[PDB]
Write an enzyme that holds these catalytic residues in place. Structure first.
Site, short mmCIF file in Angstrom:
data_model
loop_
_atom_site.label_atom_id
_atom_site.label_comp_id
_atom_site.label_asym_id
_atom_site.label_seq_id
_atom_site.Cartn_x
_atom_site.Cartn_y
_atom_site.Cartn_z
N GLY A 1 0.77 -1.23 0.00
CA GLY A 1 0.00 0.00 0.00
C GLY A 1 0.81 1.29 0.00
O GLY A 1 0.39 2.30 -0.54
N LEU B 1 3.94 -12.63 -15.14
CA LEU B 1 4.59 -13.90 -15.44
C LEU B 1 6.07 -13.66 -15.30
O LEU B 1 6.91 -14.48 -15.68
CB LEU B 1 4.24 -14.36 -16.86
CG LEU B 1 2.85 -14.00 -17.38
CD1 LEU B 1 2.82 -13.74 -18.90
CD2 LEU B 1 1.83 -15.04 -16.96
N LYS C 1 9.23 -12.20 -18.37
CA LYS C 1 8.91 -12.51 -19.75
C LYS C 1 7.56 -12.02 -20.23
O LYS C 1 7.37 -11.81 -21.44
CB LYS C 1 8.98 -14.03 -19.93
CG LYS C 1 8.58 -14.78 -18.66
CD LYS C 1 8.07 -16.19 -18.93
CE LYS C 1 7.99 -16.97 -17.61
NZ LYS C 1 8.19 -18.43 -17.81
N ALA D 1 10.34 -3.02 -5.00
CA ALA D 1 8.96 -2.66 -5.24
C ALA D 1 8.54 -3.43 -6.48
O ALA D 1 7.59 -4.22 -6.44
CB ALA D 1 8.83 -1.16 -5.43
N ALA D 2 9.33 -3.26 -7.55
CA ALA D 2 9.08 -3.77 -8.90
C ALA D 2 7.64 -4.13 -9.21
O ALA D 2 7.00 -3.47 -10.00
CB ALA D 2 9.97 -4.98 -9.16
N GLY D 3 7.12 -5.16 -8.55
CA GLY D 3 5.71 -5.49 -8.63
C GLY D 3 4.87 -4.53 -7.82
O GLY D 3 3.65 -4.64 -7.80
N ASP D 4 5.52 -3.60 -7.14
CA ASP D 4 4.82 -2.57 -6.39
C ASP D 4 4.68 -1.32 -7.29
O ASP D 4 3.66 -0.64 -7.28
CB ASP D 4 5.57 -2.22 -5.08
CG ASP D 4 5.30 -3.20 -3.92
OD1 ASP D 4 4.34 -2.95 -3.16
OD2 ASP D 4 6.08 -4.17 -3.72
#
Lengths: 306, 306
Positions: A41, A221, A224, A249-252
């Protein structure tokens, strides 16, 4: 008033480097101690706001002077701190990670103040929930709270986004109220029971997900692609051949940016490229709040790649 | 200029109850995390201040929203924050103490500001160290920092007490500058080769100290009481009919009070008794640097016993 709403968990990560793992009895002398503000968050909103979004934050922090060192730290980076409330005598969440740095990482996490994100805890924030065009949430806050937020929206219209991270399990009655979902392969599985590894199995997840009232399903995924499905129309986005750096974070930021797309009238596929830029720039970057790039960046990056 | 001078560490104790001892790989959802002010050098100077003594502290903290608030916290407890050298761009020192709900513990220690205290860092503090009547110090800061502190104290007829905590092996050159020593069972073997468990064995380790230049040797064994060996003419002392719960600040209160005693002209023989009270009151209180009683509290307590 506001237009974007994040509902999630702020929490400080206490980092210290040790020479080895522990064990019962003795003690370890550590090195390079640092505190990096973290928690989904909090990331998926500082991620947003740096892309100038009209964003508001709903989270619960403590009064341990840091808990206050973050309610501003936020407020400056664009974000409306109205619904970030101070919990009296509860500290903001924590992570104690003794480092290997000799192997793998021992993580001990508390939830502390984050545990106050309940149904009655945001009755005043429903105002903002309804008058908002969107809503972003992850699963580092209690469902009881994640729920009223969703329900208050759907009834008075507002598309609702859920990062299934960190991975757990959800009740059907909730995923119906989600207008997207951006799980990750290893998570995603626990939500349906379908090990994602290739294109055809990547599709089975969606329909199984879709079948639960969800319009759009974008399962990261990772290294890729970004499996996109608008009622079953599964696809693939080859991401970015770059030079990776830490997880952080990357996926954040990714999930943080994807919502920054949708507000500025972009169609999804246009955003997913945009998101993946942020997910590609700041993955040469590191830390947490240190990674996240500005609009000036990503837009420039998009240009630099063609 | 203050009559008693303490030289030692500062800590922040990050305690979070863990339900299963930490292992590699995955994480953990522990609970009830507390930040408890600590550090041997710091307990004892706070112990001292609680017994209405004239104490000044010589220690290293950091920029940390702690290392400042703790220094302001010191003064509200009556401390000469003179030698509380602060540290720029550095965190303090910390203890990451993971419980196990139960089984065993995981205390993890971090260096940080408790390190700047080198021979060179205490130079303007000779000013304080020399004209002061006593010098109280332990072993959680750099060795070369103490080594200089002891000698210029002695050469300026200032008494020096050495709490060898936490236990370590030490060189001579310094032990010739100590006026009193305070070890335990665990501390002795690391310096005298003796496993010391009873009266015949306790007289022998002492001598080694005596043979290393130490006059007053007070080997405390929490449960069974203290063996004093004031030049061989030694005896056993029953420390109050009590327990030990948070022994953390127990042997810290002992040491804080014992020197607080000797300072008020009490005879050696009587001050060991004095401390034994405060430790006995300190040990019954849950918490670490909160488990320390007020003077009236200790003094009144004394009357109620005999």
């Amino acid at each position: 008033m506001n237009k974007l709403v994040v509902l999630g968990s702020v929490n400080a990560d206490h980092v210290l480097q040790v020479p080895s793992f522990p064990r019962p009895g003795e003690t370890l002398h550590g090195r390079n101690y640092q505190v990096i503000p973290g928690g989904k968050g909090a990331n998926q909103a500082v991620a947003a706001a740096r892309m100038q979004a009209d964003v508001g934050f709903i989270a619960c922090v403590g009064d341990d002077s840091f808990g206050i060192n973050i309610r501003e730290s936020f407020k400056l980076d664009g974000i409306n701190t109205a619904g970030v409330k101070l919990q009296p005598n509860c500290p903001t969440g924590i992570a104690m990670i003794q480092v290997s740095d000799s192997g793998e990482n021992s993580i001990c996490i508390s939830a502390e103040a984050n545990a106050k994100l309940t149904a009655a805890a945001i009755e005043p924030d429903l105002a903002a929930i309804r008058d908002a065009r969107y809503l972003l949430m992850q699963l580092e806050t209690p469902l009881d709270g994640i729920l009223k937020a969703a329900q208050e929206a759907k009834t008075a219209k507002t598309n609702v986004i859920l990062n299934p991270a960190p991975a757990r399990e959800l009740p059907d009655e909730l995923l119906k109220c989600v207008d997207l979902i951006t799980p990750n392969e290893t998570e995603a599985e626990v939500l349906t029971g379908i090990t994602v590894y290739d294109d055809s199995s990547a599709q089975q997840a969606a329909d199984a997900l879709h079948c639960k009232g969800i319009e759009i399903v974008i399962i990261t995924l990772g290294s890729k692609g970004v499996w996109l499905s608008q009622n079953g129309r599964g696809q693939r986005i080859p991401g970015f051949v770059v030079k990776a750096t830490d997880t952080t974070a990357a996926g954040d930021t990714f999930n943080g940016a994807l919502v920054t797309g949708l507000l500025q009238e972009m169609p999804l596929e246009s955003a997913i490229k945009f998101a993946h830029a942020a997910a590609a720039i700041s993955v040469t970057r590191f830390g947490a709040q240190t990674s996240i790039p500005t609009r000036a960046e990503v837009e420039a990056f998009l240009a630099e790649h063609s």
